[PDB]
């Protein structure tokens, strides 16, 4: 494919490469997510002066704004005080919805789709490490303290 790239892909993307990829990776991942534009004799002219000169640094400062969105919450901790079972065995397993609502109500305003859970649905009541996908390289180290009630 002659598809020119826009985002910093962690394998072959370095802001302006013409690396040959398959059509299924371009049509289903790069195009609908805005990651890359298929270049056929006019998008090269679009990327030549209008995109690589101005909009690449705009994407870089939007990545810096995502880093600042990570740097909104300086506490980086969430104390969940939901109802629990008798001596452990928590009542309801907390997914990404309640964690995203607790971070959005006080702290980072990131959406639910960037929230990742390394330790499952967090059935164990205690200290847990939760990372956020605010950026493809810089990750979060949120310390969630599940407290039994």
């Amino acid at each position: 494919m002659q598809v020119i790239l826009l985002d910093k892909v962690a394998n072959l993307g370095s802001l302006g490469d013409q690396v040959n990829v398959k059509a299924g990776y371009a049509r289903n991942f790069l195009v609908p997510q805005g990651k890359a534009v298929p270049a056929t004799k006019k998008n090269i002219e679009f990327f030549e002066a209008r995109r690589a000169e101005l909009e690449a640094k705009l994407a870089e400062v939007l990545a810096a704004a995502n880093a600042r969105a990570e740097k909104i919450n300086a506490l980086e901790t969430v104390t969940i005080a939901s109802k629990a079972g008798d001596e452990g065995k928590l009542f309801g397993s907390i997914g990404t919805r309640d964690i995203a609502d607790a971070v959005t109500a006080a702290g980072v305003e990131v959406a639910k789709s960037e929230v990742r859970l390394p330790n499952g649905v967090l059935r164990t009541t205690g200290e847990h490490e939760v990372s956020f996908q605010v950026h493809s390289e810089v990750f979060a180290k949120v310390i969630v303290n599940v407290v039994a009630e």
């Binding site: 065995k89 009542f91 309801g92 397993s93 499952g120």
Partner: protein, 271 residues
């Protein structure tokens, strides 16, 4: 109990009736009934598809609550009713808020027992709860396939599923026929065995118990014609062939299980 009838006439000799004395003798709860129109084994095209059914006594559909969407609500079992479309009995249960619902009646259930539903349900039989608070090794029924489906497995009379393994978010179950398979741990189940376990002991006595139920007499392949069945023909009780279906598919041993979508869920096949 299971009462064998006396041979007062030719036809009542082999009648063995399963008489439950605790069933309510009266009309059921009317807003939970709807119509159940008979089909006779015919599709929208009007041709017969599932043969050897038709006729019999009429019946009305009872809306039996499968999902148990109420959580944290106590439930007092009002009475027991006989569902004609099932093999086991159903239970009319009056909830705390005043809503009467039909559920599947377990084995250890009488008039006056208290059950509940939700994740805060106990280990007492009759409670419906998801498969992440149940101790591994007990007996469950009304097994849901997907979270929120309602329940597909272990719902006939006497059918029960024992929990074998718990691999993270997967629950490996042993079914009634003996097929090990994995389901989602978020699926719900009702504790205990399904009641009316003596329902297999009825041997129906006569042809009339097959006729008024909906079982039509079955014609053998030897009695048919070569244009009507692959078997048949010959000058007097000649078989001379291999046992097949009337549509040319081999029977008495042929694995037709071919979907290739739920083979990951199946652990060990039926033996």
């Amino acid at each position: 109990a299971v009462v064998k009838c006396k041979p007062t006439s030719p036809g009542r000799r082999h009648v063995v009736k399963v008489v439950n004395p605790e069933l309510h003798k009266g009309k059921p709860f009317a807003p939970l009934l709807e119509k159940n129109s008979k089909s006779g084994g015919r599709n929208n095209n009007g041709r017969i598809t599932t043969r050897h059914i038709g006729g019999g006594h009429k019946q009305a559909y009872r809306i039996v609550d499968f999902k148990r969407n109420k959580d944290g609500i106590p439930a007092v079992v009002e009475r027991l009713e006989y569902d004609p479309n099932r093999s086991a009995n159903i239970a009319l249960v009056l909830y705390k808020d005043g809503e009467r619902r039909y559920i599947l009646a377990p084995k250890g259930l009488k008039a006056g027992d208290q059950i509940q539903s939700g994740v805060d349900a106990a280990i007492k039989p009759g409670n419906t709860l998801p498969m992440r608070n149940i101790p591994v090794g007990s007996t469950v029924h009304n097994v849901e396939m997907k979270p929120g489906k309602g329940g597909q497995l272990a719902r006939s009379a006497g059918t029960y599923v024992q929990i074998v393994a718990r691999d993270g978010a997967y629950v490996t179950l042993r079914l009634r026929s003996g097929e090990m398979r994995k389901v989602e741990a978020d699926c719900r189940a009702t504790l205990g065995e399904v009641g009316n376990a003596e329902h297999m002991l009825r041997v129906l006595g006569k042809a009339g118990a097959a006729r008024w139920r909906g079982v039509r007499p079955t014609v053998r392949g030897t009695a048919m014609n070569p244009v009507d069945h692959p078997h048949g023909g010959g000058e007097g009780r000649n078989f001379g062939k291999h046992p097949v279906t009337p549509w040319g598919v081999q029977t008495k041993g042929k694995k037709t299980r071919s979907n290739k979508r739920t083979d990951k869920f199946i652990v060990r096949r039926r033996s």
